Every structure is written in C-alpha cells, then in structure tokens.
C-alpha cells in the first residue's frame, strides 16, 4: 500500500473542477512574525492527517494574491500550501530561492499546531510564477531532497539548470514575451539532467500571466506532478504520461 494516498482515485473532470474534495481553511504568517520572507497564507485541509508541504512564490512587482487562486485549489487535494509574499516586490530569483526555502521552515517550525500536526515535514514541493519560478529552479538545485518542484512560466537569467536532481514540471506559455520560452522556458527543461523525472508543457494560446488567472490545464498538471511526486501517488502516473496544450515533453514513464 502506499501510506501518503488521500483522496479518491484521479479523473480528468476532478482535476480539472475549481477544487478537490477536500474543505480548506486559511492561517495568515504576518510580515514581522514570518523570518526570511515577507509573509503569506496558508492554506491547509481541515480533514486531520499529514500532508506534503508546498511554497508559492509570485513573480517581480506580485504579491501572494497573483498565485493565490492556485494555493488554495492545490490545497483542496490534500496539501499544506504558503503562498508568500516577498521581503520586496523587486527581489531576484536568487532571493526568492531563500524566501522560499525561509516559508518551508515557517509551515514546519513556526506555525501553529493544527498547521504544523498536518505536515510531513519530509515531503516538500516548491513552485513560482515568473522569477518565483527561477527562484523554484534555484532552491530545486540547491536541495536535493524536495519531493517535487514546479516553474511556472519561468524567468532567470542562468538557464544551466542540469544540477537539479528533484523532479520538475516546467509550465510555459507559448505567446510569453516577457519569459519568452525560447530562452526561458525550453533551455530550462532542455538543461535539468535526461536521468531525472521532469517533464515541459507549454500552454497554447496564453500569455505570461495565464498563471496568475485561475485554470484548468494548470491546476490539472500542478496537482498530478505533486500527487505523483509529494505522495508517491502512481495512480496519477497516467495524466503525466504521456500526456496531453500546444507542446510537452517528458522523461515518462519516470
Ligand atoms: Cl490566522
């Protein structure tokens, strides 16, 4: 059995719904209480288990409200979820790396004790919008051991990427003239090494702020790659591969 399975088993139309089955509720991390990042939501099942733990980061001028939409519906299948704020909206991905991996000790140390009881502190998944998901590729190769990490129409200026290890889903959008994928999105995949579980999918017909607006192929794929990734969950394996959306890519089967 695989002790980390929640939920019932996956379908296209319950991946797709605005949200899971499972009821969320929300605990704020104030700007002074929260170290190392600027604060945020968190959103968290109200069902008592453990869960895998998830950090959101929003992109150059955002705040946690561009990538709230995804928090929650990602915690409404069964995940503790930080959407930060960042010390300043003008932070580089580099630093968002270090708000990122700051709000992942924040859920597990500093958080109350119906948030901190519902976490597995040894299943974490990191993503981000834009330069948040440069800082998701930067903290991905400096840690190892998280369980899942997802760019989402990434931006940063290093695009040698192949000392990640953990498994990622690069999410780009075809018409993107701010991360164009071209010299963003594609050399990012193209770099994360042949041997690891990754995979690209590039949205057809969407611009670079399709993650900030709540949709469908978006939160399917988030969901999928953290089910597979955070919980070991293979009875998701299906969606990833081989897949579906104008291109993706993938080291399927994993
Ligand atoms: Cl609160």
């Known amino acids: 059995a695989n002790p980390y ?9 319950l991946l797709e719904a605005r949200s899971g089955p499972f009821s969320v509720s929300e605990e704020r991390a104030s700007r002074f209480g929260a170290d190392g990042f600027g604060g945020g939501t968190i959103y968290y099942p109200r069902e008592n288990n453990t869960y895998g ?3 959101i980061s929003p992109g150059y001028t955002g705040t946690q409200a561009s990538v709230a939409w995804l928090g929650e519906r990602i915690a409404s299948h069964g995940f503790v979820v930080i959407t930060i704020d ?15 991996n700051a709000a992942l000790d924040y859920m597990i140390n500093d958080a109350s004790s119906a948030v901190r009881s519902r976490i597995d502190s040894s299943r974490l ?21 998280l369980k899942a990490a997802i760019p989402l129409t ?3 200026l290093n695009k040698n990427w192949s000392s990640v290890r953990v498994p990622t889903l690069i999410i780009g959008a075809d018409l993107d003239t701010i991360a164009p994928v071209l010299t963003h999105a594609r050399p990012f995949y193209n770099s994360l090494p042949t041997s690891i579980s990754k995979a690209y999918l590039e949205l057809d017909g969407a611009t670079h702020f399709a993650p900030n607006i709540p949709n469908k192929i978006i939160g399917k ?33 994993f």
């Open 5 to 13: 399975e929640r939920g019932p088993n996956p379908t296209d139309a």
């Open 53 to 55: 733990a998830v950090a």
């Open 86 to 100: 960042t010390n300043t909206t003008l932070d580089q991905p580099d630093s968002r790396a270090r708000q990122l």
């Open 125 to 145: 998944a990191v993503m981000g919008h834009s330069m948040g998901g440069g800082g998701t590729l930067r903290l991905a190769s400096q840690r190892p051991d």
């Open 154 to 156: 990434p931006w940063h």
């Open 221 to 253: 794929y988030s969901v999928a790659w953290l089910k597979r990734f955070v919980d070991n969950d293979t009875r998701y394996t299906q969606f990833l591969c081989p897949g579906p959306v104008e291109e993706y890519r993938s080291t399927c089967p």
